[PDB]
Design a binder for these strands. Structure first.
Ligand SMILES: *C(=O)c1cnc2ccccc2n1
Ligand SMILES: *C(=O)c1cnc2ccccc2n1
Ligand SMILES: *C(=O)c1cnc2ccccc2n1
Ligand SMILES: *C(=O)c1cnc2ccccc2n1
Ligand SMILES: [Mg+2]
Ligand SMILES: [Mg+2]
Ligand SMILES: [Mn+2]
Lengths: 8, 8
DNA sequence: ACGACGT
DNA sequence: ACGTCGT
């Protein structure tokens, strides 16, 4: 849920 | 019902 | 009744 | 280095 690199 | 990973 | 990620 | 959900 975080998007720091993916942002699922 | 939400789809944040599944979206049922 | 439903599970996922990459720069 | 980063965590989330409601019909
Ligand atoms: C988002 O909050 C979150 C938490 N855990 C995960 C695990 C695997 C893929 C994506 C994810 N996203
Ligand atoms: C984004 O591509 C990515 C990959 N690995 C991680 C590890 C820990 C926190 C965030 C990350 N983001
Ligand atoms: C969607 O709103 C919702 C709420 N609760 C659930 C529980 C189990 C599976 C799917 C669900 N979807
Ligand atoms: C999606 O794959 C997934 C898995 N676990 C969760 C927990 C809480 C909110 C959203 C979620 N999404
Ligand atoms: Mg990875
Ligand atoms: Mg709920
Ligand atoms: Mn986590």
């Amino acid at each position: 849920x975080a998007x720091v690199x993916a942002x699922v």
